[PDB]
Amino acid sequence: LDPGLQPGQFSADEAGAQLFAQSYQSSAEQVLFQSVAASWAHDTNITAENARRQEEAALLSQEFAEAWGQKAKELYEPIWQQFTDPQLRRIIGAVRTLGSANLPLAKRQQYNALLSQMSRIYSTAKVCLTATCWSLDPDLTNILASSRSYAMLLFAWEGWHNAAGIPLKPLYEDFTALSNEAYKQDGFTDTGAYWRSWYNSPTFEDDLEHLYQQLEPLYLNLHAFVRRALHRRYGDRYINLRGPIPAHLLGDMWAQSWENIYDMVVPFPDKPNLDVTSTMLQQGWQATHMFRVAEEFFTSLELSPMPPEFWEGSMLEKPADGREVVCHASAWDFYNRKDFRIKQCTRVTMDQLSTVHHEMGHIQYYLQYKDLPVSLRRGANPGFHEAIGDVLALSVSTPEHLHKIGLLDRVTNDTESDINYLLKMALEKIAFLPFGYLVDQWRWGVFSGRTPPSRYNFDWWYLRTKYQGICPPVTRNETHFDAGAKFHVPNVTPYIRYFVSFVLQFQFHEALCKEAGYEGPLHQCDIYRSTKAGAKLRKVLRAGSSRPWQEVLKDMVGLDALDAQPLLKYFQLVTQWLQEQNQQNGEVLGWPEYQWHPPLPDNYPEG
Ligand SMILES: *[C@@H]1O[C@H](CO[C@@H]2O[C@@H](C)[C@@H](O)[C@@H](O)[C@@H]2O)[C@@H](O[C@@H]2O[C@H](CO)[C@@H](O[C@@H]3O[C@H](CO)[C@@H](O)[C@H](O)[C@@H]3O)[C@H](O)[C@H]2NC(C)=O)[C@H](O)[C@H]1NC(C)=O
Ligand SMILES: C[C@H](CP(=O)(O)[C@H](Cc1ccccc1)NC(=O)[C@H](N)Cc1nnn[nH]1)C(=O)N[C@@H](C)C(N)=O
Ligand SMILES: *[C@@H]1O[C@H](CO)[C@@H](O[C@@H]2O[C@H](CO)[C@@H](O)[C@H](O)[C@H]2NC(C)=O)[C@H](O)[C@H]1NC(C)=O
Numbered sequence: 001l002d003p004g005l006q007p008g009q010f011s012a013d014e015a016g017a018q019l020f021a022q023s024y025q026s027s028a029e030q031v032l033f034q035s036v037a038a039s040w041a042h043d044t045n046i047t048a049e050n051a052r053r054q055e056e057a058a059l060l061s062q063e064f065a066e067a068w069g070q071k072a073k074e075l076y077e078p079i080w081q082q083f084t085d086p087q088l089r090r091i092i093g094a095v096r097t098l099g100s101a102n103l104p105l106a107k108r109q110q111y112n113a114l115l116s117q118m119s120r121i122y123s124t125a126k127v128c129l130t131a132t133c134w135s136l137d138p139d140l141t142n143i144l145a146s147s148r149s150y151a152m153l154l155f156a157w158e159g160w161h162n163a164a165g166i167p168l169k170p171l172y173e174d175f176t177a178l179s180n181e182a183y184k185q186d187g188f189t190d191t192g193a194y195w196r197s198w199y200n201s202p203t204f205e206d207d208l209e210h211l212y213q214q215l216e217p218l219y220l221n222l223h224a225f226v227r228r229a230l231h232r233r234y235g236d237r238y239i240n241l242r243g244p245i246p247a248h249l250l251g252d253m254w255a256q257s258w259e260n261i262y263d264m265v266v267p268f269p270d271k272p273n274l275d276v277t278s279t280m281l282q283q284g285w286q287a288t289h290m291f292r293v294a295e296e297f298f299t300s301l302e303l304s305p306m307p308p309e310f311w312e313g314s315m316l317e318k319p320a321d322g323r324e325v326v327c328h329a330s331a332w333d334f335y336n337r338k339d340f341r342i343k344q345c346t347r348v349t350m351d352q353l354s355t356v357h358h359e360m361g362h363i364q365y366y367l368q369y370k371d372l373p374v375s376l377r378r379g380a381n382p383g384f385h386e387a388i389g390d391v392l393a394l395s396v397s398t399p400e401h402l403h404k405i406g407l408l409d410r411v412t413n414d415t416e417s418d419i420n421y422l423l424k425m426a427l428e429k430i431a432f433l434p435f436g437y438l439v440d441q442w443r444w445g446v447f448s449g450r451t452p453p454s455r456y457n458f459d460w461w462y463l464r465t466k467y468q469g470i471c472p473p474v475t476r477n478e479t480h481f482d483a484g485a486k487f488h489v490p491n492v493t494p495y496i497r498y499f500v501s502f503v504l505q506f507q508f509h510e511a512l513c514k515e516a517g518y519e520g521p522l523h524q525c526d527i528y529r530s531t532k533a534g535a536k537l538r539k540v541l542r543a544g545s546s547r548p549w550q551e552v553l554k555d556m557v558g559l560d561a562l563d564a565q566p567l568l569k570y571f572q573l574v575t576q577w578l579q580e581q582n583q584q585n586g587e588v589l590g591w592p593e594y595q596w597h598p599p600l601p602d603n604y605p606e607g
């Protein structure tokens with residue numbers, strides 16, 4: 001560790017703790033910078049030499065975290081919990097938490113190499129047909145989205161899960177043991193306990209379950225309606241009206257968003273076509289247009305534009321040269337208050353437009369809290385950060401807004417059009433809920449030891465069937481590691497944040513619409529050009545993690561807890577309509593033939 005980056009001396013009392021805290025933050029910026037920079041170089045240009053530089057950069061950050069971590073515990077361990085300043089207790093609480101830096105050197109290197117290898121495996125895996133091979137993004141993504149051929153979709157689903165999942169498994173086991181070993185020395189029973197403590201709610205798991213119970217009837221009804229629509233296209237052989245849906249027929253590799261099958265489920269096809277992708281293609285929209293249009297929504301609210309550094313630095317398309325990259329969208333803060341970037345392999349579609357807004361939301365957060373102490377540059381909780389861009393995307397997807405931006409010529413205000421719109425949004429928002437809830441339930445069980453390696457896939461599919469009511473379209477066994485085929489698992493980044501954001505964003509939407517002075521139905525609200533709504537959103541963004549998230553929420557929304565009510569209110573019309581339709585069609589809500597799997601196509605796997 002470079003001498004400048006090492007800690008000096010401070011008094012062993014609260015007043016000393018304040019100075020320790022101030023100096024820690026000054027040094028940390030450079031170490032965060034070189035780390036993030038080394039990660040960028042690798043993720044935008046995957047090579048062994050860049051991977052090695054990233055591993056070296058991570059080692060340095062562990063050195064840093066060790067020096068300052070041990071210093072905080074040297075001075076403050078028996079006394080920091082009774083400190084009078086609660087904002088101090090949060091940083092000294094953090095700095096005394098070493099994480100992987102608790103590992104001896106050889107295991108640090110093993111830990112860093114594992115993250116590097118798992119990430120490379122997920123992002124360079126391919127499905128080969130003969131000579132040629134498909135990558136996840138764009139090739140397999142476009143197949144899952146626009147093929148309606150049962151066999152083709154199955155070849156893509158099976159291919160990807162095998163390519164990514166199988167080689168990840170032995171590495172994921174080693175990672176889990178090293179991860180737990182590290183956080184066990186910080187006082188947590190396991191890494192999962194550490195991840196949960198970010199929400200600082202002693203009753204987090206029960207609060208989540210009580211939320212899910214309110215939402216589950218909305219999913220069951222969406223599920224049944226959709227299952228019926230599929231049965232009409234695929235037939236009685238491949239779809240069971242009383243069983244789970246095959247996991248490859250919902251438009252998405254993880255069946256996590258159902259937006260791509262909108263055309264099969266749209267109840268009133270004679271109204272305006274709310275999927276706007278084909279108009280985007282016809283008009284010749286490119287990535288740059290999508291980002292500029294996103295930016296302009298932000299600036300309409302009197303929030304910040306993207307700085308020159310973002311446009312010069314960002315990667316907005318998959319590289320055309322001979323270069324491999326991590327294609328999973330991501331937003332980047334370099335912790336120097338100047339450099340902020342998005343890395344997205346942007347495709348020209350309506351959902352990608354929402355994703356552009358999603359990522360730009362992360363950046364806008366960075367732009368607003370950049371003058372705060374580096375430790376306070378986070379969301380109020382991780383769910384806040386994930387909700388910002390989605391909030392705006394709610395206004396952007398409205399037919400009234402799509403008209404303003406030239407993507408929809410008709411603009412009708414009738415109950416059939418509302419049901420079309422609300423159903424489309426449910427395919428994106430309601431269909432995600434079960435998946436968003438289950439990923440970290442799986443991962444928490446793995447970290448606790450409840451799910452050992454011999455049950456990784458057993459317990460994944462139990463949860464997948466339990467919550468989503470889907471089944472794998474081919475037989476799986478414990479050699480498969482289907483969880484590993486989802487980005488966030490091998491990239492070791494938590495998921496519960498997405499479930500929290502899909503609820504929170506409707507709470508934000510309701511409050512910003514009210515502040516904008518908007519009076520009609522909540523699902524028709526567009527906050528475009530509302531400076532008042534902007535000022536309110538800005539207060540949350542500039543606060544960072546300096547105050548408890550319960551208080552930040554209260555000031556914005558009037559409530560100090562997560563609440564499903566605004567989401568229910570938003571969807572109320574289609575919730576009532578879907579119930580009615582399923583009764584009238586004699587549907588069964590749920591999948592009581594839980595053991596059912598579809599047969600293989602006759603010529604599997606040829607074509
Ligand atoms: C789409 O249409 C709805 C419904 O509009 C209402 O019913 C229709 C059948 C017609 O008869 C309309 O003339 C009638 O307004 C619109 O929602 C409605 O918007 C109005 C005005 O924004 C709301 O009236 C307000 O009510 C509040 C009290 O909550 C008062 O403070 C205000 O003074 C104001 O009068 C009305 O509540 C609202 N209706 C419902 C059921 O929520 C909607 O605006 C329209 N959408 C678009 C994009 O034009
Ligand atoms: C499209 C979005 C990408 P994201 O912006 O949340 C992406 C996911 C990710 C996480 C770690 C490494 C690399 C990427 N998150 C980010 O880029 C940011 N670092 C999130 C952030 N949080 N605080 N500051 N920044 C995402 O993954 N969405 C969920 C719903 C999904 N598609 O499963
Ligand atoms: C991808 O990364 C490699 C390093 O892994 C970069 O290659 C270096 O480029 C510089 C300047 O052009 C040379 O001086 C080095 O000798 C190169 N290293 C190697 C191992 O070849 C490369 O520039 C990166 N590509 C892009 C587009 O950024």
Ligand SMILES: *[C@@H]1O[C@H](CO[C@@H]2O[C@@H](C)[C@@H](O)[C@@H](O)[C@@H]2O)[C@@H](O)[C@H](O)[C@H]1NC(C)=O
Pocket residue numbers: 474475476477478479480
């Ligand atoms: C797990 O399954 C592996 C491959 O899958 C099998 O073959 C495919 C083509 C399907 O038809 C399906 O029935 C089978 O699952 C096997 O090679 C492997 O032996 C299995 N693993 C164990 C431990 O038995």
Ligand SMILES: [Cl-]
Pocket residue numbers: 198382383494495496497
């Ligand atoms: Cl999280």
Ligand SMILES: [Zn+2]
Pocket residue numbers: 358359362385386
């Ligand atoms: Zn995100």
